[PDB]
């Protein structure tokens, strides 16, 4: 059972990015797409890193993306984390 | 960033292709400092947001102990955590992480003798094998050897690898009687 | 007369590698002729002296042969290996050692960490005429001194290379050289390169098949002064065959959990060593003789390698092998000793090493 | 030919009930745990004789005087001064034994060779009694999965 | 046996709707959209 799941956590994180859920079978279109998205994209301490930097920036200093952020961060909805959604999906036609 | 965000949001442009390259020290200077997240933005669409990641977390980011966290928490919203709650789950870690990390970062404020002798070993060992070859009397061997026989080409064939048994045999001596010396 | 005796020697080489695991399998089968005519070895009577019993008596001749059989094709293993599977040792170490010159610079921009044995003995290679000697690129000097020469020096990096400073321009520019003679001794001597072979010894003294197949001759070796070294050699099935590396591979998959269990198991055992040395002291006598006791908890080592070996190895725990503790003050508490002793290390201890080897099956 | 032979003596009816196993065919379900890994269940058995042989090679050679078993004085029953003899008392009882070779022989306590025979006893019950043993089971376990 | 019949059971629940027999991966082109569907559009509770 201890085997199984660690197991599944692997499959799941080589299968699956953590933020938009979409598997690596959209992504691996493009040679390392994968690896480019969930190291470049949705890297999960990236966003990490952004809250740091959200939570250490003076709030009168804040540009209109980050007090978008800071405002759904502050009432706790989590609706600016891209779910089933991304750039290179969004702008699919443009980009490619 | 100014570059990086028209880069990426000009991914066709040639005019823009051939002025980066102008750039690129600069651009490589602030790779590891640049960060890049993905978010849905006001205007319903997927937003591409560019800020600034310090040294000193990314120093406290790949501290051991934070990766074993990191590892930890993904253990448990992987088995033990649903889908509705996996962004509140990732957003209550993060905020412990970056806690732990901002006083990490406060709090922290400002053998090799075993492979000598094994070296040493292999050096002497192989150079008393070479000093039969770095001998130069072997004339004496050439002399005796000039009536050619197939026995004695077989004879001596099989002596050379004699030797460099022997030889292996008297470094793994040396070997054993250097780690007696060292342990104690 | 020197390149007929050389052919000679390829075809000699050329054999032995080809021969190599043919001989590999014949050293295996000696083995089990010896070990099963040691099965008919007796002890004899003070001088003492063991001796081959036989009605025939043709076992103990045979028993001879073979040994001096075995000792021939543990050598000509050792020759077959050096002929056919050095090569490619070395070929890989090169290949190893000049990509990481050229895409590292581990001898130009960094260093060996002085613990590192592959990493301090690669420093004799470098500059050594006949490097790429088995490996492809002969160009890779030529590449490092590329990279690396503006930055580093085009003489530092040649220094450090072994590569001739100006003597290769006076070379494409003008000078003459005359011929040698390959039956030429003195010839020979100087073509042969002392510190790349050197190197290659040091190489071949360090890897981990040539020192085990040195092993094999060496206790096949000492198998003639004493026959009983001969039954080392059937520890080289696991290596010989390969359909007894899946039954092994169970114990050595899950193989550092079977070591940190009976480290654990150590502990536990002594944890209750601790207990018995403290309260449990009377219950150790083991022998009926009244006048003189023998005590096996009266001291701490003592009564440690009782509980480590008697109560261990026993099928109830330590409970079977001392004392009744019916109609004592210590008594619920040593049930509860004993009982405990029984489900933590008998049953539960001893189902951690059952079940580590079935999950590696799995 | 066996139900033939069973009217000379009566007793070769019983080889008959070696037909269950052909005839049902849920008994094939459990019979094929031990048939499925059939040859790695041959290979361990092989194993073990094998490590009981380097076993009785140490003792022949290193612990003789431990194998007596009578308290008659006058007749030693020495099961380890021949080889062969040594080979099948290490095979047959110090195998079948719940604990290993060790709960058969005599004690070693204040004796040269102790440390030595306890590590020879320990040894002998991980690598025989525990490890090899467990082997087995794991095989028939594997197989059902 | 009875550890992977339960983990089964769930792995089918939550890739596959009951009724329909639709996968979460056609749902969750929106976001929560399995959690939707099978929780507004197709409960089993809604059925009975
Ligand atoms: N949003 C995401 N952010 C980061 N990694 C992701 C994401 N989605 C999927 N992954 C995958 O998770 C993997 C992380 O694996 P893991 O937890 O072993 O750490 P790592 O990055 O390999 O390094 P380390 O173990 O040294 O901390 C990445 O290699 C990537 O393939
Ligand atoms: N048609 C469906 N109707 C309801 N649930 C469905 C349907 N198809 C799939 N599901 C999944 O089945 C899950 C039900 O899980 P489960 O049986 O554990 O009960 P639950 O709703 O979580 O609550 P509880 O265990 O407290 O009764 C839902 O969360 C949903 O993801
Ligand atoms: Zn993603
Ligand atoms: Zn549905």
């Given at each position: 059972?201890?085997?199984?799941?660690?197991?599944?956590?692997?499959?799941?994180?080589?299968?699956?990015?953590?933020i938009?859920?979409?598997?690596?079978?959209?992504?691996?279109?493009?040679?390392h797409?994968?690896?480019?998205?969930?190291?470049?994209?949705?890297?999960?301490?990236?966003?990490?890193?952004?809250?740091?930097?959200?939570?250490?920036?003076?709030?009168?200093?804040?540009?209109?993306?980050?007090?978008?952020?800071?405002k759904?961060?502050?009432e706790?909805?989590?609706?600016?984390?891209?779910?089933?959604?991304?750039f290179?999906?969004?702008?699919?036609?443009?980009?490619? | 960033?100014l570059?990086?965000?028209?880069?990426?949001?000009?991914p066709?442009?040639?005019?823009?292709?051939?002025?980066?390259?102008?750039?690129?020290?600069?651009?490589?200077?602030?790779?590891?400092?640049?960060?890049?997240?993905?978010?849905?933005?006001?205007?319903?669409?997927?937003?591409?947001?560019?800020?600034?990641?310090?040294?000193?977390?990314?120093?406290?980011?790949?501290?051991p102990?934070?990766?074993?966290?990191?590892?930890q928490?993904?253990f448990?919203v992987?088995?033990?955590?649903?889908?509705?709650?996996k962004?509140?789950?990732?957003?209550?870690?993060?905020?412990?992480?970056?806690?732990?990390?901002?006083?990490?970062?406060?709090?922290?404020?400002?053998?090799?003798?075993?492979?000598?002798?094994?070296?040493?070993?292999?050096?002497?060992n192989?150079?008393?094998?070479?000093?039969?070859?770095?001998?130069?009397?072997?004339?004496?061997?050439?002399?005796?050897?000039?009536?050619?026989?197939?026995?004695?080409?077989?004879?001596?064939?099989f002596?050379?690898?004699?030797?460099?048994?022997?030889?292996?045999?008297?470094?793994?001596?040396?070997?054993?009687?250097?780690?007696?010396?060292?342990?104690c | 007369?020197?390149?007929?005796?050389?052919?000679?020697?390829?075809?000699?080489?050329?054999?032995?590698?080809?021969?190599?695991?043919?001989?590999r399998?014949?050293?295996?089968?000696?083995?089990?002729?010896?070990?099963?005519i040691?099965?008919?070895?007796?002890?004899?009577?003070?001088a003492?002296?063991?001796?081959?019993?036989?009605?025939?008596?043709?076992?103990?001749?045979?028993?001879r042969i073979?040994?001096?059989?075995?000792?021939?094709?543990?050598?000509?293993?050792?020759?077959?290996?050096?002929?056919?599977?050095?090569?490619?040792?070395?070929?890989?170490?090169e290949?190893?050692?000049?990509?990481?010159?050229?895409?590292?610079?581990?001898?130009?921009?960094e260093?060996?960490?002085?613990?590192?044995?592959?990493?301090?003995?690669?420093?004799?290679?470098?500059?050594?005429?006949?490097?790429?000697?088995?490996?492809?690129?002969?160009?890779?000097?030529?590449?490092?001194?590329?990279?690396?020469?503006?930055?580093?020096?085009?003489?530092?990096?040649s220094?450090?290379?072994?590569?001739?400073?100006?003597?290769?321009?006076?070379?494409?520019?003008?000078?003459?050289?005359?011929?040698?003679?390959?039956?030429?001794?003195?010839?020979?001597?100087?073509?042969?390169?002392?510190?790349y072979?050197?190197?290659k010894?040091?190489?071949?003294?360090?890897?981990?098949?040539?020192?085990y197949?040195?092993?094999?001759?060496?206790?096949?070796?000492?198998?003639?002064?004493?026959?009983?070294?001969?039954?080392?050699?059937?520890?080289?099935?696991?290596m010989?065959?390969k359909?007894?590396?899946?039954?092994?591979?169970?114990?050595?998959?899950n193989?550092?959990?079977?070591?940190?269990?009976?480290?654990?198991?150590?502990?536990?055992?002594?944890?209750?060593?601790?207990?018995?040395?403290?309260?449990?002291?009377?219950?150790?006598?083991?022998?009926?003789?009244?006048?003189?006791?023998?005590?096996?908890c009266?001291?701490?080592?003592?009564?440690?390698?009782?509980?480590?070996?008697?109560?261990?190895?026993?099928?109830?725990?330590?409970?079977?092998?001392?004392?009744?503790?019916?109609?004592?003050?210590y008594?619920?508490?040593?049930?509860?000793?004993?009982?405990?002793?029984?489900?933590?290390?008998?049953?539960?201890?001893?189902?951690?090493?059952?079940?580590?080897?079935?999950?590696?099956?799995?």
């Open positions: 059972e201890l085997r199984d799941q660690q197991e599944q956590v692997k499959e799941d994180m080589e299968t699956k990015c953590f938009c859920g979409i598997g690596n079978d959209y992504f691996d279109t493009v040679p797409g994968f690896e480019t998205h969930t190291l470049q994209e949705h890297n999960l301490a990236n966003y990490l890193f952004f809250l740091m930097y959200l939570i250490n920036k003076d709030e009168t200093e804040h540009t209109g993306q980050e007090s978008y952020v800071w759904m961060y502050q706790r909805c989590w609706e600016f984390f891209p779910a089933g959604d991304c290179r999906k969004q702008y699919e036609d443009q980009l490619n | 960033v570059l990086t965000n028209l880069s990426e949001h000009m066709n442009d040639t005019r823009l292709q051939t002025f980066l390259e102008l750039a690129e020290s600069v651009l490589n200077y602030f790779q590891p400092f640049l960060g890049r997240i993905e978010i849905m933005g006001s205007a319903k669409r997927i937003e591409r947001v560019y800020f600034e990641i310090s040294e000193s977390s990314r120093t406290q980011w790949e501290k102990q934070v990766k074993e966290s990191k590892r928490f993904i448990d992987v088995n033990e955590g649903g889908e509705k709650e962004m509140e789950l990732f957003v209550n870690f993060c905020e412990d992480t970056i806690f732990e990390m901002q006083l990490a970062a406060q709090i922290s404020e400002s053998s090799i003798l075993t492979v000598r002798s094994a070296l040493f070993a292999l050096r002497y192989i150079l008393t094998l070479m000093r039969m070859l770095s001998l130069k009397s072997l004339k004496k061997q050439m002399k005796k050897v000039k009536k050619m026989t197939v026995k004695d080409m077989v004879t001596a064939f002596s050379s690898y004699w030797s460099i048994f022997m030889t292996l045999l008297h470094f793994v001596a040396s070997v054993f009687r250097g780690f007696f010396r060292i342990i | 007369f020197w390149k007929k005796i050389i052919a000679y020697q390829q075809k000699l080489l050329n054999y032995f590698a080809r021969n190599f695991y043919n001989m399998m014949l050293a295996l089968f000696v083995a089990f002729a010896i070990n099963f040691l099965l008919f070895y007796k002890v004899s009577t003070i003492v002296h063991y001796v081959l019993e036989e009605s025939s008596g043709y076992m103990e001749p045979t028993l073979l040994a001096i059989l075995h000792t021939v094709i543990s050598f000509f293993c050792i020759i077959g290996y050096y002929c056919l599977k050095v090569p490619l040792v070395i070929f890989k170490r290949k190893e050692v000049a990509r990481k010159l050229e895409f590292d610079g581990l001898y130009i921009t260093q060996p960490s002085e613990d590192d044995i592959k990493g301090q003995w690669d420093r004799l290679v470098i500059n050594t005429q006949s490097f790429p000697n088995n490996y492809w690129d002969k160009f890779v000097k030529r590449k490092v001194m590329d990279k690396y020469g503006e930055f580093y020096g085009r003489d530092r990096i220094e450090l290379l072994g590569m001739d400073k100006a003597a290769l321009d006076f070379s494409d520019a003008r000078e003459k050289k005359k011929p040698k003679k390959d039956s030429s001794l003195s010839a020979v001597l100087n073509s042969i390169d002392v510190k072979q050197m190197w010894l040091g190489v071949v003294f360090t890897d981990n098949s040539f020192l197949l040195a092993w094999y001759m060496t206790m096949s070796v000492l198998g003639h002064y004493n026959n009983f070294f001969f039954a080392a050699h059937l520890l080289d099935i696991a010989g065959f359909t007894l590396r899946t039954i092994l591979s169970s114990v050595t998959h193989g550092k959990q079977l070591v940190l269990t009976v480290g654990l198991l150590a502990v536990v055992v002594y944890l209750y060593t601790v207990v018995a040395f403290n309260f449990f002291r009377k219950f150790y006598n083991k022998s009926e003789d009244g006048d003189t006791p023998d005590m096996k009266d001291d701490m080592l003592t009564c440690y390698m009782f509980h480590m070996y008697v109560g261990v190895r026993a099928g109830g725990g330590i409970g079977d092998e001392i004392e009744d503790p019916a109609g004592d003050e008594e619920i508490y040593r049930i509860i000793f004993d009982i405990t002793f029984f489900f933590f290390v008998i049953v539960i201890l001893l189902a951690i090493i059952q079940g580590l080897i079935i999950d590696a099956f799995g």
